[PDB]
């Protein structure tokens, strides 16, 4: 296991990268285990949001 395991098709998006729910890997090897990824929209200012592949 290695930090950066894509576990999906090519052109997939890794952790902390912008996305639109069509480009999001199934899992990712970050911080010592296998964690899934889902494209969520985090708070980044007044009524603003940046949508980013976040672990769940």
């Amino acid at each position: 296991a290695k930090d950066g395991d894509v576990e999906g098709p090519a052109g997939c998006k890794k952790y902390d990268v912008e996305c639109d729910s069509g480009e999001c890997c199934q899992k990712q090897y970050l911080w010592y285990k296998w964690r899934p990824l889902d494209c969520r929209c985090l708070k980044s200012g007044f009524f603003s949001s940046k949508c980013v592949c976040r672990d769940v």
Binding site: D20, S21, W31, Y32, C39, R40, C41, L42, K43, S44, G45, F46, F47, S48, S49, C51, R54
Partner: protein
């Protein structure tokens, strides 16, 4: 007149005026020595060149009386002096006065910034520009004369003293007296006079302080009694610690009384957990703190809590602990420390100090401030009255069924701002941003279709259409800067659409129609509050600011606290926190690094800030805001029978005490399990029988329409539903069993004074409900804004136990999880609007607000480690919410109960709501003279031995020296301290013995003479009960000491005899006014305090069923919990004043790592239920703290205003009692007749306002008294003749005409 005639009669011969200014005027007159054509009554500008300025102001200087100009006294060197003529033409001109107001306001900026070397030379030019102000103004007025001196007006005393300090602090003393340098900020009080309308609020501020003189002396007396009471029962008790046993098998020797003491004094042998800077307290009582099994709970070892500042060991620290308790400032820490070491029956000490301290005497402070402000408003409103004396678009846009469409879009748009939160989906985020483009495109089309049907000559007049046009121009600049990653704070003006709805539902519009009307009153009080906060924040920063840096090692961890005096912004916030009611925590840290002078600072900022300024804000909210027919006969006679209704009430009370006894340890009481089981079967037959009796008596349509019978019907259904479960299978629901507690609010509504207390709650609930809805609206604007500032930003990297890492180690969430730490969120977090509501409740009640405001000023960005005070200007968010949400919305509940209780007491006493206030002063004076009886004198005996004993008993010189020896017996108790020498206590116990033998002599003189009538005075019982127990405690050589007579119970009876001095305070006027209001309100204050206990009983039993098995988190531990009834009443009484509810919430909502309840093993589960805990505390805090504690302020305001109104116009019940103390010495046998010759001597022997002065016989014949047989007159004919005399001379003889009609209609 007094001032309007004396200042003109002194112009005749003593000293005349010199000049005047009314709209750029400057005259030239003299003192009738050599005046040259100023004014006689010319009203013209012909003679001089400078008198033309003071010529057209003849109709302006005479506005109200003389409130347009000021007049100097030309009496020293006025004429033939060219220098002084320049000084009048300098002082009077307004450009010299507006130059100082700029000079003061610039000088206040140089205080909020940290100083430098260029600040010093710039300080020196202000000191030489204020000398120029003094040397001109003394020259034009004279230093000290009798007319119009410089040192006569108290705005020049502050101008002169602050200038003289600026000489002393600038030529010498550069190391000693740093303190006097800080009082050059008091000059900035002069800029009050630049905000229009200031003389209403400053004169109400002056009147409030001088009218509290009678109450400060009464409050200092009551703090003296409670501190001596706390000293005698709590000295040494806060030094109780669990101490380890002396090791039997092992070291420290074998045993010696010196080696035992050496072992026990060691701090390593005292019990602490692996946390907790302070050590836990223990006790030997039945519900106190318990020690772990190797410990023994000794007293006298190693320091008091809170650095040694919280104790009852000396009188001075007991005085600070008792003052902390009345002022209610973190008192639940003193409350929990005291019951953990002394036991839970000492809740009775805390009830007495809270009832008489904060529920009575802090509510007399509010009443005086309300009367002072109301008297200043009626002075101003009376004077202000003297000042008075394109075609098809119109069918679409102006449609009323089109304005309904915009009201839908606004409520949709407010919902889409509240639905915005941290960490949402994409499809949820796509709806909210697409709804933005729809809602802005609706608002643009509306603003175009309302300027084509209402062409822009007319559109910009409506003042909602010009507010709406500001919304549209912000929406297009947001739409144009949408892709730009530049400034992007234009998107924060989306919050301003929320106020556009106010147009539609009217109780928001009627709420804001007051604030836009009386805005000048709110501006003056807010500016005076922030000016006081500025003055205290510069003084404390220069008195105390250097101690925090120089003595930083005394704090735990050697680090500065969050709250300190190092710069201006910290100093402003620590002073603002004290105005919100929290000062002793900031004063413990001040005394630790500093001297004693932190204590006068923090009391004065509390006394001015909380008790006067915030009470002025409440005062400003008041002023601006055939067998079938026989069965219905028998059931009707049973339902009305009095012995039947006592039986039904007695069953409901006995059975609810059984419901308090079922708690934890109940399955260990197997007999009590069967008692409470058969009671549930008797009651489920009792409720069914009493329902069918009331259903044949009252009927169907009058039964199911009453509100007490629908409450009655639910408890019958709840016990039929639990019956059919226990008859088939399922065990009974325990929540439905507890519905029988509501059956005892109807017998509570009939307890001889609860008619006024329950009617002011039923009538207040639609008024309370509209203030909740307006409160939910304004907090929604702050809740959205807190989400847009702080959502996702309260995460932080934490250690294995609890410790927040430094930002040099962990920079983000990557560094936190790479190093196997934990990335953790705060429990109060602003992550959505629901969490923000629960966060904004803790900042408005000031309970939990310190941890929420640490997270806000440490916040950086999402996924970054917070750094302490990295945006410290987020304090501005919280100041703006506390002013508009706490200081304005929550104090509006007090305004409601004050107004309704005035109405419901006027209804209960039979009075009309159509008589004026002056007609009801006249009616009260007539109701009292008809309910008056002469008092029969205590008879004097005949035997010589016991008659002398009566004559010296009734003597006033004996009754005075009896009171001096009680004050001397209790001042000796005030110099008991903890740790006093054995030779000191032997002096005070030989001095105590000579006081018992004196109090035994004067008790037997008052029984030998003055017989069985002795036991009718309520204070002669306590004078008797103490002397009996004091002889019993000294006699009987064989003192048992096994629970015989408590030394505590003997020392409470010494202090309880001081209350005789409340009778001798009836000589001072302002004290007699204030005790009388307490005596007349004491029945309805007890009824509020007995309704409060029944509400506490409901939340105790329900809380005992919800939160009996929760694990020890927050403020819940092995002493304070919901496990028994007695321990629930401990918490819910603390919770009744909202004190420390944040830590109770943290334990009753804790559902993180909790065991699940397993039914088969018989395990209850220790988990929290967050949803039920919110509906428990928030329901409790708005019922018990906002509407029932504020009921005490409603009642005291109505009785203080009544009694002061009788002092000014009426007659004040004590003056009726004055009449029969002097009727008694001319009619001792209660004959209720005196002779005609005695009434000339009786009318002189009276007191004002009821005394007739000599010569009496000229005034006796002016009034007609119907004389009975043999020159005998009646007391009712004398007293009614005197009430007519009092109301004849006060206002007018016309107002003497309004009092005969109550005397005729009633007699």
């Amino acid at each position: 007149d007094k001032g309007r005639g004396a200042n003109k009669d002194r112009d005749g011969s003593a000293h005349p005026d010199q000049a005047l200014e009314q709209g750029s005027r400057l005259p030239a007159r003299m003192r009738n020595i050599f005046p040259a054509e100023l004014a006689s009554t010319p009203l013209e500008d012909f003679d001089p060149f400078y008198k033309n300025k003071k010529t057209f102001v003849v109709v302006t200087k005479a506005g109200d009386i003389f409130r347009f100009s000021g007049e100097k006294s030309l009496w020293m060197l006025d004429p033939f002096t060219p220098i002084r003529r320049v000084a009048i033409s300098t002082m009077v001109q307004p450009i010299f006065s507006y130059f100082i107001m700029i000079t003061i306001l610039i000088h206040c900026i140089f205080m909020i910034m940290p100083a430098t070397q260029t600040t010093y030379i710039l300080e020196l030019v202000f000191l030489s520009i204020y000398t120029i102000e003094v040397v001109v103004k003394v020259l034009a007025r004279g230093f000290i004369l009798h007319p119009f001196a410089y040192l006569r007006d108290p705005w020049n005393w502050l101008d002169f003293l602050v200038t003289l300090i600026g000489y002393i602090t600038l030529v010498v003393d550069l190391g000693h007296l740093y303190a006097l340098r800080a009082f050059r900020v008091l000059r900035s009080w002069r800029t009050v006079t630049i905000v229009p309308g200031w003389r209403t609020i400053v004169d109400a501020l002056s009147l409030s302080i001088t009218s509290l003189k009678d109450l400060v002396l009464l409050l200092l007396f009551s703090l003296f009694v409670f501190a001596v009471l706390g000293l005698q029962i709590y000295m040494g008790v806060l030094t109780q610690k669990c101490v380890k046993h002396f090791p039997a098998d092992g070291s420290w020797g074998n045993f010696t009384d010196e080696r035992w003491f050496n072992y026990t004094s060691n701090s390593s042998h005292w019990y602490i957990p692996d946390d907790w800077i302070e050590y836990p307290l223990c006790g030997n009582s039945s519900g106190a703190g318990m020690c772990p099994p190797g410990y023994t709970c000794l007293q006298g070892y190693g320091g008091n809590p809170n650095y040694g500042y919280t104790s009852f060991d000396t009188f001075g620290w007991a005085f600070l602990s008792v003052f902390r308790l009345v002022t209610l400032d973190y008192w639940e820490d003193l409350y929990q420390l005291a019951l953990r070491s002394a036991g839970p029956w000492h809740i009775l000490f805390f009830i007495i100090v809270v009832f008489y301290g904060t529920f009575c005497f802090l509510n007399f402070i509010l009443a005086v401030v309300v009367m002072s402000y109301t008297h200043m408003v009626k002075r101003a409103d009376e004077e202000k009255a003297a000042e008075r004396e394109q075609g098809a678009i119109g069918a679409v846009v102006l449609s009323p069924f089109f304005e309904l469409f915009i009201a839908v879009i606004i409520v949709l748009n407010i919902t889409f701002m509240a639905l915005d939160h941290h960490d949402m989906n994409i499809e949820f985020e796509r709806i909210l941003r697409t709804g933005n483009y729809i809602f802005t495109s609706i608002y643009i089309v509306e603003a175009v279709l309302k300027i084509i049907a209402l062409s822009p000559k007319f559109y910009f007049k409506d003042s909602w259409n010009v507010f709406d046009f500001i919304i549209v121009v912000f929406a297009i600049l947001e739409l144009g800067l949408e892709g730009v990653q530049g400034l992007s704070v234009f998107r924060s003006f989306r919050l301003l659409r929320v106020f556009r709805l106010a147009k539609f539902w009217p109780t928001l519009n009627n709420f804001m129609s007051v604030m836009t009307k009386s805005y000048g009153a709110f501006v003056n009080v807010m500016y005076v509050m922030f000016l006081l906060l500025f003055i205290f924040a510069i003084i404390g920063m220069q008195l105390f600011g250097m101690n925090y840096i120089d003595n930083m090692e005394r704090f735990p961890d050697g680090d500065l606290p969050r709250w300190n005096f190092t710069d201006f912004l910290h100093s402003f916030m620590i002073v603002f926190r004290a105005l919100c009611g929290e000062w002793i925590e900031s004063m413990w840290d001040c005394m630790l690094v500093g001297d004693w002078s932190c204590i006068p600072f923090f009391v004065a900022v509390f006394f001015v800030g909380n008790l006067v300024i915030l009470n002025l804000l409440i005062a400003l909210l008041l002023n601006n805001y055939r067998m079938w027919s026989n069965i219905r006969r028998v059931c009707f006679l049973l339902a009305k029978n009095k012995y039947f209704q006592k039986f039904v009430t007695a069953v409901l009370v006995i059975t609810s005490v059984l419901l308090a006894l079922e708690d934890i340890y109940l399955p260990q009481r197997p007999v009590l399990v069967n008692i409470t089981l058969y009671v549930d079967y008797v009651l489920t037959a009792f409720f069914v029988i009493e329902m069918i009796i009331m259903l044949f008596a009252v009927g169907f349509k009058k039964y199911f329409t009453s509100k007490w019978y629908w409450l009655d019907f639910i408890v019958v259904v709840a016990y039929l539903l639990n019956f059919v479960l226990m008859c088939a299978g399922i065990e009974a629901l325990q929540t439905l069993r507890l519905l029988r507690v509501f059956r005892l609010f109807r017998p509570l509504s009939k307890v001889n004074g609860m008619q006024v207390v329950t009617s002011t709650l039923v009538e207040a609930v639609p008024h309370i409900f509209n203030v909740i809805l307006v409160g939910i609206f304004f907090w929604l604007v702050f809740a959205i804004m807190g989400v847009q500032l702080f959502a996702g930003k309260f995460y932080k990297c934490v250690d294995e136990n609890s410790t927040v890492l430094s930002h040099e180690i962990t920079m983000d969430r990557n560094d936190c999880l790479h190093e196997n730490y934990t990335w953790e969120n705060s429990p109060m977090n602003f992550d959505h609007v629901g969490n923000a509501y629960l966060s904004l409740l803790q900042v408005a009640t000031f309970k939990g607000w310190l941890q929420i405001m640490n997270d806000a000023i440490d916040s950086r960005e999402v996924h970054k480690q917070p750094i302490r005070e990295t945006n410290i200007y987020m304090y501005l968010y919280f100041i703006f919410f506390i002013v508009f949400g706490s200081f304005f919305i929550l104090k509006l509940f007090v305004c409601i109960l004050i107004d309704i209780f005035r109405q419901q007491r006027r209804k209960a006493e039979g009075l009309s709501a159509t008589d004026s206030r002056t007609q009801l002063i006249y009616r009260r004076a007539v109701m009292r003279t008809m309910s008056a009886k002469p008092v029969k004198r205590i008879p004097k005996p005949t035997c010589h031995p016991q008659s002398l004993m009566y004559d010296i008993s009734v003597n006033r010189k004996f009754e005075y020296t009896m009171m001096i020896l009680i004050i001397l017996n209790v001042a000796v108790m005030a110099i008991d301290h903890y740790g006093q020498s054995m030779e000191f206590s032997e002096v005070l116990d030989y001095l105590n013995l000579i006081f018992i033998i004196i109090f035994f002599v004067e008790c037997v003189i008052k029984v030998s003479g003055l017989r069985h009538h002795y036991f009718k005075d309520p204070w002669n019982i306590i004078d008797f009960l103490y002397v009996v127990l004091a002889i019993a405690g000294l006699m009987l050589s064989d003192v048992i000491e096994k629970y015989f007579i408590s030394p505590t119970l003997l020392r409470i009876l010494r202090i309880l005899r001081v209350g005789r001095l409340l009778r001798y305070f009836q000589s001072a006027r302002g004290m007699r006014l204030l005790l009388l209001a307490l005596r007349k309100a004491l029945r309805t204050l007890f009824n509020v305090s007995f309704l409060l206990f029944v509400i506490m009983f409901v939340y105790a039993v329900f809380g005992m069923e919800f939160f009996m098995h929760i694990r020890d988190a927050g403020a819940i531990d092995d002493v304070y919990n919901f496990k028994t009834f007695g321990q629930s009443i401990i918490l819910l009484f603390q919770l009744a004043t909202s004190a420390g509810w944040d830590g109770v919430y943290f334990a009753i909502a804790n559902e993180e790592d909790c065991r699940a309840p397993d039914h088969e093993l018989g395990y209850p589960g220790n988990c929290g239920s967050r949803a039920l805990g919110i509906a428990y505390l928030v329901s409790y805090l708005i019922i018990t703290c906002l509407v029932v504690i504020n009921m005490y302020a409603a009642v005291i305001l109505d009785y203080v205003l009544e009694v002061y109104e009788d002092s000014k116009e009426g007659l004040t019940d004590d003056d009726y009692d004055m009449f029969f103390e002097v009727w008694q010495q001319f009619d001792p046998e209660a004959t209720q007749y005196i002779r005609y010759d005695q009434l000339s001597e009786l009318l002189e022997a009276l007191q004002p306002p009821l005394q007739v002065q000599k010569p009496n016989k000229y005034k006796i014949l002016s009034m007609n008294i119907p004389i009975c047989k043999d020159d005998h007159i009646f007391y009712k004919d004398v007293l009614e003749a005197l009430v007519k005399d009092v109301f004849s001379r006060r206002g007018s003889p016309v107002e003497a005409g309004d009092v005969q009609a109550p005397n005729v209609d009633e007699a």
